[PDB]
Amino acid sequence: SLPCDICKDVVTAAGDMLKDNATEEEILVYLEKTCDWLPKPNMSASCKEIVDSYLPVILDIIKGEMSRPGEVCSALNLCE
Amino acid sequence: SLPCDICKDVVTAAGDMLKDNATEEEILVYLEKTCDWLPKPNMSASCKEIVDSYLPVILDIIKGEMSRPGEVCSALNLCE
Amino acid sequence: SLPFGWLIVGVALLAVFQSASKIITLKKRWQLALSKGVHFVCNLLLLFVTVYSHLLLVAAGLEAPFLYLYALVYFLQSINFVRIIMRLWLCWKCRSKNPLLYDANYFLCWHTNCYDYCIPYNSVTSSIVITSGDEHDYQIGGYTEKWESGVKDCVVLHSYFTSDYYQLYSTQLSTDTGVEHVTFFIYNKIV
Amino acid sequence: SLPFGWLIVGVALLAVFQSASKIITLKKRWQLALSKGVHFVCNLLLLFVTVYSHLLLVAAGLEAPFLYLYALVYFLQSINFVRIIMRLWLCWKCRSKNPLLYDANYFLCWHTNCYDYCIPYNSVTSSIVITSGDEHDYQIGGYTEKWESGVKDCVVLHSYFTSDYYQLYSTQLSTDTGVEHVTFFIYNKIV
């Protein structure tokens, strides 16, 4: 059960650090910069629509995933 | 049996190209250069003894291995 | 005129995908599919990185001491590609994508009007046991396939080259063994 | 003061070992050992290359845009290391090196005075069939182990965490099935 201790601690720490509102702003800035350096000329619209619309969706599904540390640790064969 | 055709052709070609006497000299030169650039100060004696004594052994066991193209091709799951 | 940052970013991506690949379990079907996709992306990254490093060595005129090595990297990869070429074709032989998902040496297939069962198997044995039961399902060696149709009297173990046909001799119902809700089908190899 | 040729030579070695690893079959015991050794050397080369590239990015002050990525490369690798740590320990649980050689999810072990049998298995099933015969040997799902001692009435399927005990109910000799020189042992899971 020793690997489970560190696995649950790590995943709860990730959920806590991602709980900050500034984390969402940093993620949005990183997403904008991702298509800012890309050679595709249509990447700006792609980000400005898809990312701006669906980033809170991934943020909240990560919320739902972090509420079950046992499940995510089991998915990595670190727990039951 | 199509992969077997190319596998046997390749292994017979390797045996034929390795059949040259100059191949042994090139291999010996490469082996000397291998320990010539190494940082170990005792690598010169290591090569001059082990390689100079046992290079024809590996050369002849490769001879024996190339006489059976089917076996070496089977070892790679390219044949029966 | 080749940006070296490409080599570093490709190395980083290859390391990421190798590290992720070795930690994915192989229990569920989606896990196997994800592992295979990660392996494919890793192979593509490996080819890209090797080609780019060959294009940087040749750009600086430093390919001479390493050229032979790169040839090996190609040759083995060629075999790898050829290996993939069999697997896909093996799939068409059994009309199932299991040969892509599983790395087993052989695959026990049998076809019906409803479904084409293809269960992984390690080696050509003189006998094969198929356990059917508990919604029911078939399984061999812990490898489980969903029960869709009945069972056949002639199953076949496929490799790329070999094809060994097994005929059903005996059936063990839950009256002769005591294992409830479980049936055993015993197949013997045909000479 | 770090020679960049090290990055290129490490990339070449890593590519060589990855290309060689994917073309080695897993039929014989020496093939499995060679594949595991090649995978270990590849993992060592991957760690060396990642560390060196981290030491070149930091040497040129270019680690800032990639630092997070490298953290991932470490974190997953950490899990990988931890995974290895279980496998070795799993070996000690069954006193066989098969968990190192095989990547199976579970291992059916049973111990005797003479030998410690440990055969790979995919998943926890309600029943397990062990086929003994043809010098004789045991095998499950095509995975073969050499016959040294008799058979036990209580075998155990080990994962790292779970341990499911199976009890032998019925034995099928070569009189009730017709498969000559072959005996079947049927085990049921204990609740």
Residue numbers in the entry:
A (entry chain C), B (entry chain F): 1 to 80
C (entry chain B), D (entry chain A): 40 to 173, 181 to 237
Text taken from the publication that reported this structure:
The severe acute respiratory syndrome associated coronavirus 2 (SARS-CoV-2) and SARS-CoV-1 accessory protein Orf3a colocalizes with markers of the plasma membrane, endocytic pathway, and Golgi apparatus. Here, we show that neither SARS-CoV-2 nor SARS-CoV-1 Orf3a form functional ion conducting pores and that the conductances measured are common contaminants in overexpression and with high levels of protein in reconstitution studies. Cryo-EM structures of both SARS-CoV-2 and SARS-CoV-1 Orf3a display a narrow constriction and the presence of a positively charged aqueous vestibule, which would not favor cation permeation. To explain this difference, we find that a divergent, unstructured loop of SARS-CoV-2 Orf3a facilitates its binding with VPS39, a HOPS complex tethering protein involved in late endosome and autophagosome fusion with lysosomes.
